[PDB]
Design an enzyme around this catalytic site. Structure first.
Site, PDB file in Angstrom:
ATOM      1  N   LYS A  59       0.845  -1.354  -0.029  1.00 44.22           N
ATOM      2  CA  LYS A  59      -0.034  -0.107   0.195  1.00 44.22           C
ATOM      3  C   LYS A  59       0.810   1.287   0.064  1.00 44.22           C
ATOM      4  O   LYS A  59       1.940   1.349   0.623  1.00 44.22           O
ATOM      5  CB  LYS A  59      -0.836   0.108   1.247  1.00 44.22           C
ATOM      6  CG  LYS A  59      -1.633  -1.237   1.559  1.00 44.22           C
ATOM      7  CD  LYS A  59      -2.924  -1.044   2.493  1.00 44.22           C
ATOM      8  CE  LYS A  59      -2.571  -0.259   3.668  1.00 44.22           C
ATOM      9  NZ  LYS A  59      -4.096   0.233   4.234  1.00 44.22           N
ATOM     10  N   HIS A  91      -5.094 -13.501 -11.988  1.00 46.46           N
ATOM     11  CA  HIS A  91      -5.745 -12.227 -11.395  1.00 46.46           C
ATOM     12  C   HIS A  91      -7.154 -11.963 -12.078  1.00 46.46           C
ATOM     13  O   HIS A  91      -7.011 -12.083 -13.441  1.00 46.46           O
ATOM     14  CB  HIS A  91      -5.041 -10.905 -11.275  1.00 46.46           C
ATOM     15  CG  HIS A  91      -5.340 -10.248 -10.143  1.00 46.46           C
ATOM     16  ND1 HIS A  91      -6.664  -9.511 -10.023  1.00 46.46           N
ATOM     17  CD2 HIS A  91      -4.825  -9.911  -9.142  1.00 46.46           C
ATOM     18  CE1 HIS A  91      -6.764  -8.818  -8.864  1.00 46.46           C
ATOM     19  NE2 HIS A  91      -5.673  -9.148  -8.356  1.00 46.46           N
ATOM     20  N   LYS A 105       2.617  -9.670  -4.233  1.00 44.22           N
ATOM     21  CA  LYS A 105       2.126  -9.465  -5.710  1.00 44.22           C
ATOM     22  C   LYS A 105       1.904  -8.008  -6.086  1.00 44.22           C
ATOM     23  O   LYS A 105       1.653  -7.139  -5.104  1.00 44.22           O
ATOM     24  CB  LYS A 105       0.816 -10.150  -5.914  1.00 44.22           C
ATOM     25  CG  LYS A 105      -0.401  -9.574  -5.255  1.00 44.22           C
ATOM     26  CD  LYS A 105      -1.628 -10.102  -5.450  1.00 44.22           C
ATOM     27  CE  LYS A 105      -2.878  -8.919  -5.906  1.00 44.22           C
ATOM     28  NZ  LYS A 105      -2.464  -8.290  -6.882  1.00 44.22           N
TER      29      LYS A 105
END
Lengths: 426, 422
Positions: free
Chosen positions: A154, A275, A179
């Site tokens: 983040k 994904h 990731k």
């Protein structure tokens, strides 16, 4: 209508269609437009999903009241590669959920399950790599090696190269797996040829300081398969002696099955991390069109996903079982995989060390990759201590220890209590 | 979050004038307990930086369930090989994870804007109907209607019957396409069928003195398979290889399948098949994106032609065929990006085609539907000639019935469809 007669036969038995090993079966939620009879609209769907007007698809089951329609697709409808005699998902999709999604006489139709017989299923790539290969790298058991502590960094997009690498280094002091965020690639504010070398150096630094192996999942999604191959080769060249520890992340819902096959067939020796960004446009229970998550996630095994994102399972284990076992039940169809490699569930959407033991009790194991947001970045001390508290929550569960008793010996897990005090049981 | 990812004081026109933002316009309804600007801002966060390049809610109409977001251009991914844009990035940012948010009942993309700096990074088309007009010996500007079919039945014909129906159609018609799942099925293997189709096209060319066009399915999972199919088809068509279009099932195989065709076979008309698109583009869907947005994106990818169906969705036609057009929310300049040709599924008999043309302003389209071809009492060939005559009559502005005498195929359409225009 002879169309209804030709494209349906409610006297066919599902058991016998399965036994013949000659038919792909699909089950759908279908509702006709006002004024169209259920069987006529269904036979029309089977026609639009095969010959138009014997390789005819057949409606073999309707429940007008349950809005349920079941269609048998003769295997020889499905397209086959000229290069290698193998199956293509593109052909399964175009027949069984293609043209049939634009029909004017149908209010909605959604695939809920499908069945592929052995002679057809075995023509799919299936996975070449899964969590077993990650356990092997980490030095954990090859059977039931347990939980892999992962995160997204983040903020998810926006970090310059140097702050990205520093946050990855800090995480890897405690956790296993990082990731890319699925959009993350070669944006002008963080170019790939600047960022990837600093991430590989961060990973080596965390490995030198902890004496533990680490894992990275790099985004290689693009439109041009030459660009996916260039990204893949650049990442492997950059990671050098650690190239075996890189997973390739593909946005296979928005980029599509061809992007996924590109990674599967050019880079089979690398973990293919599927994904699914964008999948909710059809898979949401709010949608009555396209196909369910269950159908989506089952197809990703066929494509050869090493790991597939499956969500939080209520904090849905039936989806996990269908990708991770040899023998499993869909909502309508039993599927034998005849030793096609498992795909690993990758769980996400939060979850913290206190609620992990209940998640594992429900699943019956912790053989999963967790890309936890809240669980690591909500830990009072550090994202690293957060990842350690998550692994410790798995180890506590596996031991059958009492969490609170376990906390006395395990500071990171203890400090999870003080991190999520309103989750923390009285 | 709400404060960080929204700024309703921003002016749309200054966002466009900056040339620094992709804008998206969506139909959005929050979950029952959630405020509209809170949900929109959260959507902007999930579509950008989560937590310079933060996406911003610039406009909401809570009553109209309408939300507009500005995306700084630097959010979008760029190829390392050639510094060019990729649609996969625009989709993952603008209609990606934001489609699985628990605090949104539904969100559907209705329009988007791309500024000139970012738009020009897309391939665009390299070929369109102008290239087919050239082949057909017809005008390079306003060369008119291309009369097309899918062979019936859709799938199931053996190679020889498939090739025979192609020969019979081409004696009157111009263009034949594979049905979208048609490829290398066991009952019709590609390397048996394609050589017979090429032979059929040559025979039809020899007997008519007219050029013909074929659209070959090359869809596959494996890009190597797409290239082997495309190479096999050009090899087999030999001296007629220039007259082969490559059909990609771009919705179910995805944009990587379409870029494979666009970038490996730029000299071949790229025919974009959209089987399955209805799962999101149906007005019955509140998710994903509209047919308008879908078809707009295909021009970016470089589709030579795009299936658009068959009044106001000629808003669609203008957006793919012109240099300058308006979506439901955004004006778009294409700055010379090559137009994409509408491919229509217009059943209409030779007698009703005119009202379609009237509504369009022109007949610069490829038609593949069967209603007017296979409904003709005489032959599918005669049906193709009748539909051409119905363009030619409408173009010349002759009296249909006065034209019918001197044009037996158009005439026999009057007897083919005794109802209509009466």
């Amino acid at each position: 209508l002879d169309q209804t007669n030709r494209y349906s036969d409610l006297s066919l038995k599902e058991d016998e269609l399965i036994a013949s090993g000659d038919y792909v079966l699909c089950a759908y939620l279908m509702k006709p437009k006002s004024g169209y009879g259920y069987l006529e609209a269904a036979a029309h769907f089977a026609a639009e999903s095969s010959t138009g007007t014997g390789v005819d698809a057949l409606v073999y089951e309707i429940d007008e009241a349950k809005e349920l329609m079941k269609i048998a697709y003769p295997v020889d409808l499905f397209d086959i590669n000229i290069i290698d005699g193998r199956a293509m998902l593109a052909s399964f999709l175009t027949l069984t959920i293609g043209n049939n999604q634009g029909m004017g006489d149908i209010e909605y139709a959604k695939m809920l399950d499908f069945y592929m017989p052995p002679k057809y299923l075995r023509l799919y790539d299936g996975p070449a790599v899964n969590i077993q290969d990650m356990w092997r790298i980490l030095g954990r058991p090859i059977e039931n090696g347990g939980y892999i502590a992962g995160t997204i960094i983040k903020p998810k997009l926006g970090l310059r190269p140097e702050p990205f690498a520093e946050a990855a280094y800090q995480f890897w002091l405690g956790g296993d797996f990082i990731k890319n965020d699925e959009p993350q690639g070669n944006q002008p504010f963080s170019p790939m040829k600047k960022t990837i070398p600093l991430v590989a150096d961060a990973m080596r630094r965390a490995q030198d300081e902890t004496g533990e192996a680490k894992l990275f999942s790099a985004n290689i999604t693009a439109d041009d398969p030459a660009e996916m191959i260039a990204r893949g080769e650049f990442v492997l060249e950059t990671f050098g002696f650690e190239a075996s520890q890189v997973a390739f992340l593909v946005d296979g819902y928005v980029a599509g099955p061809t992007a996924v096959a590109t990674a599967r067939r050019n880079f089979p020796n690398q973990f293919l991390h599927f994904h699914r960004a964008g999948h909710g446009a059809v898979t949401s229970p709010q949608s009555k069109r396209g196909y369910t998550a269950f159908v989506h996630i089952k197809m990703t095994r066929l494509l050869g996903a090493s790991g597939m994102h499956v969500g939080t399972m209520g904090y849905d284990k039936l989806i996990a079982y269908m990708i991770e076992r040899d023998s499993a039940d869909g909502p309508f169809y039993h599927q034998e995989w005849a030793g096609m490699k498992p795909t690993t569930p990758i769980i996400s959407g939060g979850m913290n060390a206190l609620r992990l033991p209940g998640f594992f009790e429900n699943l019956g194991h912790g053989n999963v990759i967790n890309t936890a947001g809240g669980g690591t970045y909500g830990h009072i001390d550090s994202p690293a201590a957060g990842a350690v508290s998550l692994r410790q929550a798995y180890e506590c569960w596996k031991e059958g220890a009492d969490p609170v008793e376990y906390a006395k010996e395990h500071k990171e897990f203890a400090r999870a209590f003080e991190s999520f005090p309103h989750d923390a049981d009285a």
